[PDB]
């Protein structure tokens, strides 16, 4: 009787996330702030939804796929389950930045394995993965075709969160920076050719999954904090009820109305 959904937050904790740009909170602290915001809403509203947490670029390896020397810097901190206060306390202070770097696509595969195995039976209505990275780490394009195929077959939606915001398609996208502020919320020159290459791959993947408008699902940590886009994919239909628009006599259009705006 309620909209359930399996959400897995895939956070980059690599050393480079600890690398901080003057004035701006380090992408690690920025992603942490966004994750805490998400979990906080899911916890205090007591919504029935299970949340898993995967961290990539950690010093150690605790992952089911670690067999084979593969994914040795990806740790599944939280398995798919209803979020609790212990999880919020761990995100707030227990989870510390790591010294290694991982392949963000490899981490995405770990998250996918979590969804594929812990979602058995129509227990969950929606499947969603949220990647939090800076793209500064090198990566391999080997299974990208398979990643996209497995995402479609499993019906899992994606959402990317970077320290920088999408520059305007043509022209435009540097003084003071304020997290959550409108406008100057990311260094225009801070992008690295490595970040640019990762971004092009991110763009292609989002377009391959949700078409041309998939690119709108790539946010910056700052703007993500001043929007409800983090819940977009797990957002519940407004409660609707049926009636009849009665014009006169004999004309009666069968309708169904819902509350568009409600405080």
């Amino acid at each position: 009787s309620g909209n359930k959904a399996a959400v897995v937050l895939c956070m980059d904790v690599g050393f480079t996330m600890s690398n901080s740009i003057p004035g701006i909170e380090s992408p690690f602290e920025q992603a942490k702030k966004v994750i805490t915001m998400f979990v906080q809403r899911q916890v205090f509203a007591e919504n029935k939804d299970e949340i898993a947490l995967v961290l990539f670029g950690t010093d150690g390896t605790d992952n089911p796929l670690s067999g084979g020397d593969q994914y040795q810097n990806i740790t599944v901190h939280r398995h798919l389950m209803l979020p609790d206060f212990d999880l919020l306390e761990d995100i707030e202070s227990k989870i510390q930045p790591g010294s290694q770097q991982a392949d963000f696509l490899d981490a995405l595969i770990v998250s996918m394995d979590v969804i594929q195995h812990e979602t058995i039976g129509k227990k969950f209505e929606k499947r969603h993965i949220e990647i939090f990275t800076d793209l500064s780490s090198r990566f391999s394009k080997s299974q990208l075709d398979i990643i996209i195929h497995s995402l479609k077959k499993c019906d899992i939606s994606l959402q990317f969160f970077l320290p920088f915001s999408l520059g305007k398609e043509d022209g435009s996208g540097d003084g003071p920076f304020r997290l959550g502020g409108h406008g100057p919320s990311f260094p225009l020159k801070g992008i690295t050719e490595q970040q640019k290459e990762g971004l092009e791959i991110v763009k292609m993947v989002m377009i391959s999954l949700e078409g041309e408008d998939g690119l709108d699902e790539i946010y910056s940590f700052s703007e993500s904090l001043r929007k409800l886009c983090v819940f977009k994919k797990i957002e519940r239909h407004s409660i609707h009820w049926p009636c009849r628009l009665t014009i006169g006599s004999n004309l009666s259009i069968r309708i169904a109305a819902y509350k568009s705006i409600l405080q």
């Binding site: 089911p64 067999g67 594929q116 195995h117 812990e118 058995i120 039976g121």
Partner: protein, 239 residues
């Protein structure tokens, strides 16, 4: 030419120690004796087969990557007198007591992790493995029926093993109400790629277990490959 690798996987759950109200040895006792018989036969025959004995569902865990509840009693190595003597400590009703004392039983396991350790055991062999085979001795027809995650992960790792070249053969033991392949073991076990599916029945006697084990024991070894010439032009090849 090459040395064959064979790993004996034995279930150590609460159900395995029950003699199903009969004169027959408990499925665990049946397994231990069957394994011992294979070891002796391998010593008698002149075959370079490397054997291993791995237990799962035990409280005490001893393995390469320290996975909980997995005890690798014997690594992949040639059969020896000392190895058979070690298995003899578990043979019988008195041996069951010796097993429960040395290591625990009926502990929560994870079949996914069990196959990971086993595959990692073949990884550590240097001589060319002609055949990789795992023989699962268990009486639980639907393990992890309650845990959905452990069951799907086990199905996935079984697929990964079949894609590697490892053979998975089931040695289902007496279960109250019969043993069902459809619940579990139907897809995990490796079936012949040219169909030949639903081929063996549940084992009740040691003689039956030994006959199924020894049938898939060694891969068919052709003495010679000759040409069967029906006519100057019609020639088929036979082994």
């Amino acid at each position: 030419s090459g040395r064959d690798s064979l790993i004996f996987l034995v279930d150590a759950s609460k159900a395995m120690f029950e003699s199903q109200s009969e004169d027959e040895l408990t499925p665990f006792d049946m397994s231990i004796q069957c394994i011992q018989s294979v070891y002796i036969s391998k010593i008698i025959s002149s075959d370079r087969d490397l054997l291993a004995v791995v237990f799962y569902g035990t409280e005490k865990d001893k393995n390469s990557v320290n996975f909980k509840n997995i005890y690798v009693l014997q690594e992949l190595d040639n059969p020896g007198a000392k190895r058979i003597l070690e298995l003899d400590q578990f043979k019988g009703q008195q041996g069951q007591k010796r097993f429960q004392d040395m290591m625990g039983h009926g502990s929560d396991y994870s079949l996914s992790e069990v196959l990971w350790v086993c595959a990692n055991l073949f990884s550590d062999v240097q001589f060319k493995m002609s055949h990789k085979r795992i023989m699962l001795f268990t009486n639980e027809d639907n393990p992890h029926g309650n845990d959905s995650a452990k069951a799907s992960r086990a199905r996935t790792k079984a697929g990964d093993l079949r894609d590697t070249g490892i053979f998975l053969d089931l040695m289902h033991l007496k279960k109250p109400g019969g043993f069902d392949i459809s619940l579990f073991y139907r897809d995990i076990i490796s079936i012949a790629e040219d169909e030949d599916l639903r081929v063996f029945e549940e084992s009740s006697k040691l003689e039956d277990l030994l006959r199924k084990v020894r049938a898939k024991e060694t891969r068919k070894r052709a003495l010679s490959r000759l040409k069967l010439k029906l006519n100057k032009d019609i020639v088929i090849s036979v082994g």
